Amino acid sequence: GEWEIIDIGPFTQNLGKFAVDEENKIGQYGRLTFNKVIRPCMKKTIGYEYQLYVYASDKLFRADISEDYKTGRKLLRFNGPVPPP
User: Which are the contacts of 31, defined by CB distance < 8 A and separation ≥ 6?
Assistant: First the structure.
């Protein structure tokens, strides 16, 4: 159940796109336009879980994302706007 910092390459960006698209289906904040994932991005091993900071429509949100390696990606939490890290 350990955490590591991961770089903000394409894989991390697409986790941010996943989170925004999932959040648009929820409709908590209206229609958000994905901007980018910024540092720091954390990954925990279970099978993984991610804590990310994603800009969408010019505002900063934090997303918690679960991922089942074999089966499925899962939006656990999406909150904000949050202060910059």
Answer: 24, 57
Experimental method: X-ray
Distance (Å, whole) CA 22 – CA 74: 9
How far from the centroid of its chain's Cα atoms is residue 30's Cα? 17
From residue 29, give the alpha-carbon distance in Å to each of 11, 12, 26: 24, 22, 8
Question: Which DSSP state fits 27?
Answer: T
Cα-based angle 69, 23, 6 (whole degrees, multiple of 5): 45
Last residue before each gap in the chain (C to N over 2.5 A) = 46, 71
